[PDB]
Amino acid sequence: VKFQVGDLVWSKVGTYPWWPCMVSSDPQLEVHTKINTRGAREYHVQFFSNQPERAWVHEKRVREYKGHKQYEELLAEATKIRKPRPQRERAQWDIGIAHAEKALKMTREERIEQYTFIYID
Numbered sequence: 001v002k003f004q005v006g007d008l009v010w011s012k013v014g015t016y017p018w019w020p021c022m023v024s025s026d027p028q029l030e031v032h033t034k035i036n037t038r039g040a041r042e043y044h045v046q047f048f049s050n051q052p053e054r055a056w057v058h059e060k061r062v063r064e065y066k067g068h069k070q071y072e073e074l075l076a077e078a079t080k081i082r083k084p085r086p087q088r089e090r091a092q093w094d095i096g097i098a099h100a101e102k103a104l105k106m107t108r109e110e111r112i113e114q115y116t117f118i119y120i121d
């Protein structure tokens with residue numbers, strides 16, 4: 001268990017680029033971490049994204065969020081060629097990054113209070 005509730009992380013899911021997140025407890029499972037059906041560790045995260053999104057993410061697809069400029073180092077893990085991404089996706093990623101930068105300046109307690117999602121039945 002490398003991450004705790006309120007920790008800022010980058011998550012790599014589906015076809016999306018490394019995305020700013022906050023580790024949180026799953027509302028149903030009441031844990032922020034678990035071992036999956038394949039025996040691998042996963043963390044529950046909330047994305048700093050337009051549609052309120054949460055996901056169980058494989059530990060290998062999660063990295064500590066040290067700052068927005070860390071993005072180049074994440075790409076370097078795969079390693080002049082650059083991959084494009086839609087402008088609309090970049091715009092939503094920039095808003096999420098802006099939220100993550102504000103969250104990074106807070107204490108873990110402040111961040112949990114400010115950003116944890118409200119779940120409705």
Ligand SMILES: O=C(O)c1ccccc1/C=C/c1cccs1
Pocket residue numbers: 047048049050051092093095096099114115116117
């Ligand atoms: O909701 C928005 O306007 C928004 C739009 C694009 C990217 C990120 C966000 C915000 C995410 C937040 C998570 C927890 C508290 S705010």
